[PDB]
Amino acid sequence: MRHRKSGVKLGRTSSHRKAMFQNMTNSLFEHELIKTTLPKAKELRRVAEPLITMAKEDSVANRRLAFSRMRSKTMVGKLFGTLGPRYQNRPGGYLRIVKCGNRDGDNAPMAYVELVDRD
Amino acid sequence: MIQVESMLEVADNSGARRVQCIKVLGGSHRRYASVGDIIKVTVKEAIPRGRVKKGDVMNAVVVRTKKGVRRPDGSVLRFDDNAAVLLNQNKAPIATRIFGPVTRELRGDQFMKIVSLAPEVL
Amino acid sequence: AVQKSRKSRSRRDMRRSHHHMTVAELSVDATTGEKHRRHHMTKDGFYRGRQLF
Amino acid sequence: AIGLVGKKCGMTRVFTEAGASIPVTVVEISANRITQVKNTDVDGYQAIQVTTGTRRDSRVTAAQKGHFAKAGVAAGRGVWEFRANDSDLEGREIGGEILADLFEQGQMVDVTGNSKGKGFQGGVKRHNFSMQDATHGNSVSHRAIGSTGQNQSPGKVFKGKKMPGQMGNKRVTVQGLEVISVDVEKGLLVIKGAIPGATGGDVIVRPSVKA
Amino acid sequence: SNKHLLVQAVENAQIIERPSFGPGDTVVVQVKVREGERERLQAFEGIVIAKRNRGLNSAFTVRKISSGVGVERAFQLHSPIIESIEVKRRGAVRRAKLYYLRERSGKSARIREKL
RNA sequence: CACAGGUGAUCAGGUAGAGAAUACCAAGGCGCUUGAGAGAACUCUGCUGAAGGAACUAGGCAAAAUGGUACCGUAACUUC
RNA sequence: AAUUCCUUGUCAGGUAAGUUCUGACCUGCACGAAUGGCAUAAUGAUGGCAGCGCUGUCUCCAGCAGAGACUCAGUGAAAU
RNA sequence: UCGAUGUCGGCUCAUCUCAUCCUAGGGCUGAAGCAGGUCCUAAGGGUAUGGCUGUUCGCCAUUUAAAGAGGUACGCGAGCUGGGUUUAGAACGUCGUGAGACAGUUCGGUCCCUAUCUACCGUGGGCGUUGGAAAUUUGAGAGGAUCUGCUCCUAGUACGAGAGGACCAGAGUGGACGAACCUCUGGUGUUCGGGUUGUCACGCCAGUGGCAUUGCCCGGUAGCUACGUUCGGAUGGGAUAACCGCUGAAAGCAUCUAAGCGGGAAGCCCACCUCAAGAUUAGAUUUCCCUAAAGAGCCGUUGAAGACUACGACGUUGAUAGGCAGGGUGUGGAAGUGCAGCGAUGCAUGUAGCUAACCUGUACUAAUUGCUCGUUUGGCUUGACC
Distance, CA of D24 to CA of D10 (rounded, Å): 9
The CA distances from residue D44 to B14, B51, D37, D91, in Å, are: 77, 81, 12, 20
> B73 vs D13: CB contact, 8 Å cut-off?
no
CA angle A11–A17–A23, rounded 5-degree value: 135
Reported residue count of chain B is 122
φ/ψ (deg, to 5) at D97: -120, 140
Best interface-test mutation with D: which of E6, E42, E81 has the largest number of D CBs within 10 A? E6
> How far apart (Å, rounded) are the C-alpha atoms in residues A114 and A27?
11
Residue type, B32: Y
Helices A14-31 and A60-70: crossing angle, nearest 10°?
120
Contacts for A107 with CB less than 8 Å, ≥ 6 apart = none
CB contact under 8 A, C52 and A98: yes
Rounded CA-CA distance D15/E7 in Å is 14
CB-side neighbour CA atoms (13 Å) of E18: 26
Distance in Å from the first CA to the final CA of chain A: 39
Chain breaks in chain A (C to N over 2.5 A) after: none
* Residue of B9, B79, B1 whose CA lies nearest to B41: B9
Q: How far is CA E84 from each of CA A57, D173, E27, E32, rounded to the nearest angstrom?
A: 46, 42, 11, 10
CB A39 within 8 A of CB A21: no
Would you say A62 and A79 are in contact if contact means Cβ atoms under 8 Å apart? Answer: no
* CA angle (D8 as vertex; D6, D14 as ends), nearest 5: 110
Q: What are phi and psi of C37, to 5 degrees?
A: -70, 145
CA D23 to C1' H229 (Å) is 8
D119-121/D165-167 β-pairing: antiparallel
Cβ atoms of D129 and D123 within 8 Å: the answer is: yes
Q: Rounded distance, CA D3 to CA D32, Å?
A: 10
What does each C-alpha distance from B34 to B25, B41, B107 come to in angstroms? 11, 14, 14
Cα torsion D105, D106, D111, D116: sign: positive
**E strands within chain B?**
7-10, 16-24, 38-46, 57-64, 69-70, 76-79, 83-86
Q: Which residues touch strand F (CB under 7 A)?
A: A 1-2, 8-11, 37, 39-40, 105-109; B 1-7, 65-67, 82; D 119-125, 133, 135-144, 164
Distance from CA of E107 to the nearest CA of D (A): 37
Packing angle of the helix pair A60-70, A38-55 (nearest 10 deg): 160
In chain B, where does DSSP find H-type helix? 112-117
Q: Are D51 and D73 in contact (CB under 8 A)?
A: yes
Q: How many residues does chain A have?
A: 119
What is the rounded distance in angstroms from the CA atom of residue E5 to the CA atom of residue D200? 13
CB B55 within 8 A of CB B38: no
- Residue D159 makes CB contacts below 8 A (sequence gap 6+) with none
E contact test, residue of B9, B69, B76, B121 with most E CBs within 10 A: B76
**Cβ proximity of B35 and B5 under 8 Å:** no
For residue B102, report the phi and psi dihedrals to the nearest 5 degrees.
-135, 170
| Structural contact between residues C28 and C35, judged by C-beta atoms closer than 8 angstroms | yes
Backbone angles phi, psi at D114, to 5 degrees: -100, 110
Residues of B in contact with E45 (CB under 8 A): none
- Position A105, amino acid: G
Could you tell me if B61 and B87 are in contact, meaning their C-beta atoms sit under 8 angstroms apart?
yes
CB E81: neighbour CB atoms within 10 A? 20
Give the resolution to one decimal, in Å.
3.2
Pairing of strands E27-34, B7-10: unpaired
Contact B74 E76 (CB under 8 A): yes
DSSP 8-state code for residue A52: H
Geometric angle at alpha carbon E7, from E5 and E9, rounded to 5°:
70
**Experimental method for this entry?**
cryo-EM
The Cα A44–Cα A28 span in angstroms is: 9
Task: Answer yes or no: are the C-beta atoms of B120 and E71 closer than 8 Å.
Answer: no
- Determine the distance in angstroms separating the CA of A62 from the nearest CA of chain D, rounded to an integer: 38
Provide the CA A21 to C1' F41 distance, Å, integer. 32
Question: Is C24 exposed, middle or buried (CB count within 10 Å of its CB: 0-12, 13-18, 19+)?
Answer: exposed
Of B69, B101, B116, the closest CA to residue E66 belongs to: B101
| β-pairing verdict for B83-86 and B7-10 | parallel
- Provide the positions of strand H that have an atom within 7 A of a protein CB: 11-15, 46-49, 61-67, 72-73, 75-82, 112-125, 133-139, 143-144, 174-186, 190-191, 193, 202-203, 207-212, 214-215, 218-225, 227-235, 271-275, 284-289, 294-307, 313-318, 322-336, 347, 351, 353-360, 362, 364-368, 370-371
* Partners of D183 in beta bridges: D188
Question: How distant is C1' of H75 from CA of D155, in Å?
Answer: 11
CA distance D161 to C2: 25
> What CA–CA distance (Å, rounded) separates E71 from E82?
18
Closest by Cα among B61, B52, B56 to B13: B52
How far apart CA D123 and CA D145 sit, in angstroms, is 6
CA of D121 to C1' of H216 (A): 36
How distant, in Å, are the alpha carbons of D5, E24, E90, E95 from that of E114? Answer: 55, 10, 6, 14
